[PDB]
Amino acid sequence: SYDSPDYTDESCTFKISLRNFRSILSWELKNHSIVPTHYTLLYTIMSKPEDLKVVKNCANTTRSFCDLTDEWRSTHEAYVTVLEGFSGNTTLFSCSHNFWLAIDMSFEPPEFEIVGFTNHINVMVKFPSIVEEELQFDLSLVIEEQSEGIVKKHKPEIKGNMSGNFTYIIDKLIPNTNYCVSVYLEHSDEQAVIKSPLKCTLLPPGQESEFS
């Protein structure tokens, strides 16, 4: 059916994550005809596009996602990147993209769960142990609350809160409230919603039970 043998060819899509406020950029270049294996993740900063680096640990590598915790310390900048993938022994392609960290910051790896009290909520976001007094990202945390059909977004002061087991409490709720608590970061923007797989933790559902 249809007339088109070639539908897709090299998504050349670089996915950047953020584990414990550590940067890790990856790529999505599929192969149709030629069979590539090793690649070379090259990266730079928008303000200095002339300073691209073929990361030694991400050059002719027969891997995909390359990491960068202290390699992209220019969070405030847009880490422009050029991932040149070599098919076998030759450079088969070269794709670039302006990574907006300061504006994108994709968090998810961190640990997080939530305990719900019959009437309140206990949200603990497990961010790495870091002393804000020397942090690299001013990034905030957005505690989203999806209780009993009600969705919401919180944003507690991360001034020294992103250093371990974040302690937040979602209260002011009626008994029996199963909420899906997400953990996404923000920064004066409603487009950087890295809403990770929430936690739908319910609380001891009152339901009266002949108490009054």
Task: Give the integer Cα–Cα distance in Å for 93 and 13.
Answer: 12
The number of beta carbons lying within 10 Å of the beta carbon of residue 142 is 24
Tell whether 118 and 98 lie within a shared domain.
no
The residue out of 43, 73, 106 marking a domain boundary is: 106
Tell whether 67 and 148 lie within a shared domain.
no
DSSP three-state, residue 56: helix
Q: Technique behind this structure?
A: NMR
Task: Give the integer Cα–Cα distance in Å for 181 and 179.
Answer: 6
The token pair at 150 is 């009600």
Tell whether 64 and 15 lie within a shared domain.
yes
DSSP three-state, residue 40: strand
Tell whether 28 and 127 lie within a shared domain.
no
Where residue 207 falls (left for φ over 0; alpha for ψ -120 to 50; beta otherwise) is left
Tell whether 173 and 98 lie within a shared domain.
no
Q: Which of 211, 26, 185, 19 is nearest to 109 (CA)?
A: 19
Q: What is the CATH number of the domain that holds 189?
A: 2.60.40.10
Tell whether 79 and 148 lie within a shared domain.
no
Q: In which domain, by residue range, is 178 found?
A: 107-212
Which residues does 89 contact at the CB level (< 8 Å), separation at least 6? none
Rounded to 10 degrees, what is the CA torsion of 126, 128, 133, 138?
-70
Q: Is 99 exposed, middle or buried (0-12, 13-18, 19+ CB in 10 A)?
A: buried
The residue out of 39, 72, 106 marking a domain boundary is: 106
**What is the DSSP-derived secondary structure letter of residue 28?**
B
Task: Give the integer Cα–Cα distance in Å for 201 and 148.
Answer: 10
Tell whether 99 and 114 lie within a shared domain.
no
Tell whether 57 and 5 lie within a shared domain.
yes
Tell whether 58 and 146 lie within a shared domain.
no
Secondary structure of 102-170 as H, E, C letters = HHHCCCCCCEEEEEECCCCEEEEEECCCCCHHHCCCCCEEEEECCECCECCECCCCCCCCCCCEEEECC
Task: Give the integer Cα–Cα distance in Å for 23 and 2.
Answer: 42
* Contacts by 160-164, CB closer than 8 A, 24 or more apart: 160/131, 160/132, 160/133, 161/127, 161/132, 162/21, 162/127, 162/128, 162/130, 162/132, 162/135, 163/127, 163/128, 163/129, 163/130, 163/131, 163/132, 164/126, 164/127, 164/128, 164/129
The residue out of 42, 72, 106 marking a domain boundary is: 106
Tell whether 2 and 67 lie within a shared domain.
yes
Residue type, 134: E
The token pair at 180 is 């899906």
Q: What angle do CA 28, 66, 18 make, to 5 degrees?
A: 95
Tell whether 198 and 157 lie within a shared domain.
yes
The number of beta carbons lying within 10 Å of the beta carbon of residue 149 is 8
Q: What's the distance, CA 68 to chain centroid? A: 14
Tell whether 172 and 133 lie within a shared domain.
yes
Q: Is 70 exposed, middle or buried (0-12, 13-18, 19+ CB in 10 A)?
A: exposed
The count of structural domains within the chain is 2
Q: Which of 109, 115, 128, 123 is nearest to 197 (CA)?
A: 109
